[PDB]
Amino acid sequence: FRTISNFMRVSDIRNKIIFTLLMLIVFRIGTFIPVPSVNTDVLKLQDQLQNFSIFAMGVMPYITASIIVQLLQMDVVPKFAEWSKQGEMGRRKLAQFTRYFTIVLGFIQALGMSYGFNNLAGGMLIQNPGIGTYLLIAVVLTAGTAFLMWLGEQITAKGVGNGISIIIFAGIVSGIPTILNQIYAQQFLRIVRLLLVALAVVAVIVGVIYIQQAFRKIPIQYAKRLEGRNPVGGHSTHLPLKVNPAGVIPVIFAVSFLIAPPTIASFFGTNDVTLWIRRTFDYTHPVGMTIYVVLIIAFTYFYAFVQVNPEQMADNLKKQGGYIPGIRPGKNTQEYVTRILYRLTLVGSLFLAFIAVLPVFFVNFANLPPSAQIGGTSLLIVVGVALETMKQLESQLVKRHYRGFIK
């Protein structure tokens, strides 16, 4: 195709995309190498009824550490409030504290994964279940996490785009070749059902891009024009608000807050109230499904009002610059944009709930393998990073040529 040919004729951009493909090669050979424990054959023979590697935890502690620091910017903390107030070196100090917090958080959660393996099965235990080889496993898992985030730091500077998001893309789409190898190993519904499934996948990708790439343009007008000097100028200044501002963070919240009550269900008592609360807090069946939907909606509202907070934005438009036509730049603009976010994050909430409940209500009506992942996080991450990378790359060909009036 001629777009890939246009990137083929530009040596610097094709050097950067070859750099990204080689860093994904580094990511792959980091995934294929085994762990120092001996239970790799055990998890191969069992199947635990996801996989396990040195990159098994992934960036998930760095995501939740970024969410922890962006929640403790809301309170009265003079330290982090002043680091956020400081423009550049407060941001770097904040990011380095976030790196320290995610490496200690991954270090304790790898120990938690070892303890959960011991409480799960007696085959995936180690020869010293209480003697500290778990610290060595935690150090090598956090070393893998540090290697992949340093890989992301390399590929966000020398490579194409958002370095964390490209390797998360790479990890999340690396299982669909196993799924498409499994689909005809289980197939033998002959084809009509498979073309209907492919049509529904293309239709839900059209739905997710039509919801995701949709902005609400509030036209802000800086006062710094002399209207008696020139004819009318800028319509090109506005405030873009998304339909779904939150992202996948509410879906990850609902995963966290519906897998946390199964620890209380992993009490040693295993009582009848334990089996009943485990039967109510599971979302493959409606009693957990409605809790999952309502908790997604609640935390979409919460994380919208965290990251696109109307009071901080209304103060940033009051201090340096200008206003919205008809609306005073104080608290009236904050009330106006709070109304706007009330009307947008409802649709973003319903969207995340619908797309996060598609896999359960999809594998039922298409009884084809239960490990297949389309929908929810599995769909939004791949589609958002995939088209954001091309929207980053196609902004160079417009830089390349200025075709004047003489030609």
């Binding site: 893309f169 789409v173 070749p177 990708i205 009307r343 995939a386 088209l387």
Partner: protein, 58 residues
């Protein structure tokens, strides 16, 4: 009732969002299917290659 006129408010505000057009929609769909197919066949080729290489090194 707050619910009915609030629903009217939401359905009137959603007609002011800058939705993608049909041609940019199908451009985005084509490029996202191209990227997902390109990276899944790149990952299948590297699966086969690294599997043969770890067969070689045993």
């Amino acid at each position: 009732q707050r619910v009915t006129n609030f629903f009217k408010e939401v359905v009137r505000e959603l007609k002011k969002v800058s939705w993608p057009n049909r041609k940019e929609l199908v451009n985005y769909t084509a490029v996202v299917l191209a990227t997902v197919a390109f990276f899944t066949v790149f990952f299948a080729v590297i699966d086969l290659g690294i599997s043969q290489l770890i067969r070689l090194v045993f």
